[PDB]
Amino acid sequence: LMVCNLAYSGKLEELKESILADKSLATRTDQDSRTALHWACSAGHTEIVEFLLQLGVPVNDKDDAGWSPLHIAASAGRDEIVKALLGKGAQVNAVNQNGCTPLHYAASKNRHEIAVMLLEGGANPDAKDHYEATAMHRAAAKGNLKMIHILLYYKASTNIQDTEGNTPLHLACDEERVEEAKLLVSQGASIYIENKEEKTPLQVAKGGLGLILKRMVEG
Amino acid sequence: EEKFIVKATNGPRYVVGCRRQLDKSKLKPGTRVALDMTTLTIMRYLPREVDPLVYNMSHEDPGNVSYSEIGGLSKGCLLYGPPGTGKTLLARAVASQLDCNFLKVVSSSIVDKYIGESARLIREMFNYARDHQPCIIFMDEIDAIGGRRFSEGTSADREIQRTLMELLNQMDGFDTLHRVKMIMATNRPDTLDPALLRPGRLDRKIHIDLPNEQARLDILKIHAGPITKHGEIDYEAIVKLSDGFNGADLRNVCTEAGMFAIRADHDFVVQEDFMKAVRKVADSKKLESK
Amino acid sequence: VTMMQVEEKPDVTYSDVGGCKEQIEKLREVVETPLLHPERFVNLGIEPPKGVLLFGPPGTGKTLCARAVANRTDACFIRVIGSELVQKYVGEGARMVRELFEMARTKKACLIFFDEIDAIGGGDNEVQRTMLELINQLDGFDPRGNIKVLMATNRPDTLDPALMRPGR
Amino acid sequence: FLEAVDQNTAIVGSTTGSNYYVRILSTIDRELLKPNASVALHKHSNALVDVLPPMDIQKQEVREAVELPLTHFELYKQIGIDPPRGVLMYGPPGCGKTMLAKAVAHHTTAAFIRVVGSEFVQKYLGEGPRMVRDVFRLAKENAPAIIFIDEIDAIATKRFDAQTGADREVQRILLELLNQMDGFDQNVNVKVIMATNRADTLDPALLRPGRLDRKIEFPLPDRRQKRLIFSTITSKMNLSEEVDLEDYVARPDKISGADINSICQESGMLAVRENRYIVLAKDFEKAYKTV
Amino acid sequence: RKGKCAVIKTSTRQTYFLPVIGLVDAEKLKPGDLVGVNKDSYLILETLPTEYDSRVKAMEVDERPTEQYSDIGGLDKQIQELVEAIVLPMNHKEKFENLGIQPPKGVLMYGPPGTGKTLLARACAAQTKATFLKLAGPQLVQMFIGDGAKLVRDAFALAKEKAPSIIFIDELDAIGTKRFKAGDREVQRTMLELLNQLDGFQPNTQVKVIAATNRVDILDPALLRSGRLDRKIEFPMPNEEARARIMQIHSRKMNVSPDVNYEELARCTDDFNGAQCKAVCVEAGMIALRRGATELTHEDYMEGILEVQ
């Protein structure tokens, strides 16, 4: 629609005169079940979402797949948009297409402020998706150490079994992250859990890193 | 340079010489030539062509008066379907005049019975349009491939709408069409893909009808050429009583009145059977105009 | 297979009527009477009847076929099964039916039985040639349109002979 | 020409496939008696006058073992000669054989012989040796090019019967060049890289040391290659801040596949609807479930 | 020194070279087969069109039928336009130049099934005196690809090449579906190809193409044109009067009893069709033989109606 270009490019007076001339444009959606809030949150505009959320647009408007705008603000890295959506009362544990939560995508961008705002509002630290994977599996899958640490500021679990039976320690050792494996083990990781292919975190680690893994377990 | 190697169609290869008449212009490799059974001399060459390229470059339609027989009618053109016909007589009238080619694009050539990879044909034929500097494209009966995809379309609709996505990507995408021209002809101006109805492609809209009394009178006079009538001539009743009809079907109704007059095997045809038979038969067309 | 399919052997007589009181007359008046009384059906009417149609459950099938073969008071006639047309090198069906109908013209209007239409009815276009041409040779009165029509099938799943059969 | 049975007399195969037995002319010397040659008889006399002339581990390993000897001459003489000239790659699930070949074609500016293993599978058994000798001579003469032989499993399998005598003949050609590469160990101006997806049916002569001294493997999870293949396509495409790469680097860890860049191009062909201005997860997971 | 040549292909898969030669050519120069050629010089002497594939060429080889237009009763007000539309375009070609008249090539003979429209259009084809050539709807749907193009170009190959004939098709509605893969979209390729041969061909003033549809539920909107199916004469279900007329003229040969008031059969025949009453007449001619009485009785009408229906 036209409001997709208006909220996309950031036309201030064109969108203001467009909504003040026709209030239906705010509630109108395109063929992909995406309203102006999804385009202005995907674009990161503050004033436009302050006007749309000021008029009182439903914050829980999901698309065809189920992507809530809180995933867009969490993955977007825009702290102010998270302040606005959480200020309006967004669902901190909204279910998207693949059953994930905004914690996984805010963790993907390594945005600490968004994680503090979401987890402070009551987000589940151990929120599992369809594949039984939490934010620690993905943050460890890229190397977000401080994101896992601020996840541990909220007493998150470090032994979530993945869809293949892999704990976050398995993915930390698979990513060849030494400090992350030593920190997860030092903070309560389990080295005895086995996956579907029957491989312990010691065997998954190469270069004799399992000896210092178990050494730090006993030490 | 004088004697080279030839490759026969049957499979065995040979070597021939040069004839004293021809020169080294056409003797360059990569050009199909002809040979003789005796001495293997060369009379002339053989220009390649598609077995089908002759069909695609030969269909031609004569007639130069059709450009002036369209009646009182003074990067894309939409020929929609209000109560008036002639979308084919005009495109075939200028197409019969010059057209600079005969690049006709039928709406039944995007069937793609197999996997829907018609993008090779959109980029292939439109790549031919971008290759040849002059090109005119006709798109007749686009309503069949003009599905509005309102509800969830099946695999048969999704591939046609995907070809429409290639049309979007090549009309308002990253490719201009300043020199090529397309003529989108259809039947119903209601299901014409309002996403494609953007004025960026279809600059003007020509409602093919008979609104003007001079256009209906002109088309009536060009269709009333070879007919003989009585001395009592009155065209203002036929033109006046006819309101929003089809041109070629007005020819079919007038000739239908000429056959209604030939039922009584009279050589002369009075205009009474024209008023009453064009009246009644045209009212039957209004009954069957739903 | 054509000359292999020739059959002249005595078999089950009329004594094996299977309890069908009315049906045995519905087929007996077309298998026995038209041959015995050629003039009675031409003068009394316009032509003798065409034939009957035995199908449905197999049960004791092919017994009434032999009953029809031995029922002729002159000479046992030829019967044709339908399972011989589905073979390699398709197209032989045309010449087969044209030469057995030509021999039907040679046998002074003899009667021909066609068994197992389900083996040639119901890709299958190479079979559509033989069965649609077969319909063109049955509805086509060139060999004869009066001698005998009878088909035996296990299932009614043959729609083309079911829609073309009301003609003759 | 097929074979020479004795002096001044040989056999010659006609174009139609029938072999002809014709005594050669005395004026022609023994130079034209090459078994794989383009002989031409007469149309009637059938006599010949003259013949016609026809990561970081494989990037560092292939880097220093391949391109460092390539960009310098006589190093084979002045490095304490060792033959790790043949490099072999493995791994069916990874696509490969296009990005490493592009990287080789961009890091170095020379000629390259891209010949997929089925390039000589034709009806003429003698075209193989002509092609490989022409490529060998133009390689050793023009510039130190690189021959990219892929999928050697289909042309490197043992055979005992004579029904497939064409494959045994071309594997005897593989033995011929397999001995010529032994003779070309001294100052040859060509490199022979190699890649295969099957190692069970490979011939033991190729895997013999001294010939293929580089046997690298490919991992099933291409995590860094998923990151680089998504970044190399999103760097030019419109960047959406909602697009994540952690579930799209963790899901292909389980369901591994090829041509991920082409999957992103299909995601763009589904995102060219013009209703969605920037691509998102809809056409990512939809592009996954379609292809 | 003018340029003129042609490409030759022998049956033995041998390609040669030769220019366009022979006698005065009018219908020649087309890519066809069955041309004249001597032993080895390979010249063109006698070109004649071959038309493969006899399975489509010899579809329905009918010279002329037996029934005529005088076999029905009560339809002259709607069949007279078709009788004119087949007689006057065959004999009055001279007057077509004084009046400038071109007969339509597409006539839509639509109505409910069982109305005998096939045998009635054939009954008028006996009056056309031209060669009658049937064609069935389900014959275009074949296993191989591109067959419908060969069948359509074959129909216009015998109509275009051969003498003035008559080609009547039926069951066109069974394949005239306007779907929005799909087989009826392949029938939109072949069908829209035929419509392109009835829209883009101005020399189509030759042999007409008569069509009949057993239902007008899926009506293709693109079937409206002078050359296309413009003649839309509605043929409804005949009433008991018209059914007694067509049954009387179709039963005028059998020994029918003179004490027939047509009231009992007129009452029993409710919402019936033409070919259904034809089946009642034939059935009466079937059991009337075995009834003993050579004269047709009155109970045989309802006996046949309740027998077959």
XYZ file of C-alpha atoms in Angstrom, chain A residues 17-197:
181
model
C -1.749 14.402 6.892
C -2.606 10.955 5.512
C -3.823 9.619 8.864
C -5.476 12.905 9.858
C -7.215 12.845 6.460
C -8.145 9.140 6.668
C -7.920 7.351 10.023
C -8.557 3.995 8.317
C -5.070 3.994 6.763
C -3.544 3.188 10.163
C -5.613 -0.004 10.455
C -5.199 -0.941 6.775
C -2.802 -3.772 5.944
C -1.122 -4.985 2.765
C -1.348 -8.432 1.150
C 1.254 -9.779 3.619
C -0.787 -8.924 6.755
C 1.630 -6.109 7.625
C 0.257 -2.848 9.008
C 2.050 0.501 9.193
C 3.385 -0.444 12.639
C 5.373 -3.328 11.144
C 6.864 -1.095 8.438
C 7.709 1.739 10.838
C 9.217 -0.735 13.312
C 11.119 -2.522 10.542
C 12.374 0.917 9.471
C 13.119 2.040 13.035
C 11.223 5.340 12.959
C 10.463 6.679 16.437
C 7.966 9.486 15.802
C 5.743 7.435 13.479
C 5.372 4.586 15.976
C 4.828 7.196 18.694
C 1.901 8.546 16.665
C 0.486 5.111 15.800
C 0.926 3.841 19.363
C -0.364 7.193 20.636
C -3.616 6.675 18.723
C -3.766 3.211 20.301
C -2.979 0.675 17.583
C -3.104 -2.932 18.874
C 0.447 -3.900 19.802
C -0.262 -7.639 19.410
C -1.181 -7.403 15.705
C 0.421 -10.522 14.217
C 1.018 -11.161 10.522
C 0.090 -14.328 8.619
C 3.066 -16.215 10.065
C 2.622 -14.758 13.553
C 5.477 -12.254 13.787
C 4.596 -9.775 16.521
C 6.092 -6.260 16.355
C 8.021 -6.991 19.562
C 10.194 -9.379 17.554
C 10.759 -6.531 15.086
C 11.819 -4.115 17.828
C 13.850 -6.760 19.676
C 15.772 -7.833 16.570
C 15.788 -4.222 15.334
C 18.290 -3.042 17.948
C 16.206 0.108 18.531
C 15.961 0.613 22.292
C 13.329 3.359 22.045
C 10.973 1.183 19.987
C 11.267 -1.513 22.658
C 10.470 1.160 25.250
C 7.354 2.105 23.278
C 6.104 -1.421 22.554
C 6.774 -2.628 26.099
C 5.219 0.622 27.305
C 2.021 -0.247 25.438
C 2.007 -3.751 26.946
C 3.476 -6.055 24.315
C 3.508 -9.811 24.905
C 7.060 -10.578 26.040
C 6.502 -14.264 25.170
C 4.660 -13.889 21.867
C 4.734 -16.975 19.643
C 6.004 -16.393 16.104
C 5.906 -18.744 13.102
C 8.638 -21.059 14.424
C 7.551 -20.731 18.063
C 10.481 -18.513 19.052
C 10.380 -15.528 21.419
C 11.739 -11.962 21.148
C 14.548 -13.034 23.500
C 16.132 -15.131 20.738
C 16.158 -12.256 18.238
C 17.153 -9.575 20.736
C 19.949 -11.976 21.688
C 20.795 -12.338 17.987
C 21.640 -8.624 17.735
C 23.607 -8.696 21.033
C 21.518 -5.781 22.330
C 21.854 -5.806 26.116
C 19.337 -3.014 26.744
C 16.540 -4.786 24.857
C 17.268 -8.009 26.745
C 17.106 -6.158 30.075
C 13.823 -4.489 29.094
C 12.219 -7.738 27.910
C 13.500 -10.029 30.672
C 12.652 -7.347 33.248
C 9.014 -7.244 32.119
C 8.602 -10.966 32.778
C 10.063 -12.748 29.766
C 10.897 -16.422 30.223
C 14.696 -16.882 30.402
C 14.322 -20.557 29.392
C 11.808 -19.951 26.591
C 12.054 -22.899 24.196
C 11.063 -22.863 20.530
C 9.671 -25.651 18.338
C 13.158 -27.211 18.218
C 13.504 -26.981 22.035
C 16.252 -24.360 21.712
C 16.675 -21.261 23.874
C 18.524 -17.995 23.271
C 21.723 -19.481 24.726
C 22.011 -21.999 21.874
C 21.962 -19.216 19.267
C 23.931 -16.570 21.178
C 26.505 -19.298 21.799
C 26.094 -20.315 18.148
C 27.459 -16.886 17.167
C 29.576 -16.009 20.206
C 27.489 -13.569 22.257
C 29.268 -14.034 25.581
C 27.894 -10.971 27.380
C 24.388 -11.795 26.137
C 24.647 -15.208 27.803
C 26.024 -13.473 30.901
C 23.115 -11.034 31.162
C 20.898 -14.061 30.561
C 22.575 -15.493 33.673
C 21.732 -12.279 35.531
C 18.117 -13.528 35.362
C 18.912 -17.102 36.525
C 18.614 -18.821 33.159
C 19.306 -22.514 32.645
C 22.478 -23.732 30.934
C 21.398 -27.311 30.105
C 18.510 -26.937 27.653
C 18.334 -30.059 25.491
C 18.121 -29.147 21.804
C 16.086 -31.045 19.210
C 19.203 -33.188 18.650
C 19.945 -33.577 22.367
C 22.671 -30.915 22.506
C 23.121 -28.740 25.585
C 24.351 -25.139 25.248
C 27.773 -26.509 26.214
C 27.674 -28.749 23.132
C 27.113 -25.730 20.881
C 29.686 -23.646 22.766
C 32.309 -26.359 22.254
C 31.147 -26.827 18.654
C 31.671 -23.096 18.017
C 35.241 -23.468 19.390
C 34.583 -20.893 22.126
C 37.018 -21.591 24.963
C 36.058 -18.783 27.350
C 32.345 -19.411 26.796
C 32.724 -23.126 27.534
C 34.804 -22.426 30.647
C 32.229 -19.878 31.823
C 29.221 -22.131 31.201
C 30.977 -25.045 32.918
C 32.050 -22.778 35.782
C 28.428 -21.580 36.086
C 26.744 -24.991 36.142
C 26.969 -26.753 32.784
C 26.612 -30.534 32.602
C 29.219 -32.612 30.758
C 27.427 -35.951 31.245
C 24.384 -35.315 29.031
C 24.583 -37.088 25.670
C 22.968 -36.185 22.355
C 21.251 -38.382 19.758
C 24.572 -39.336 18.130
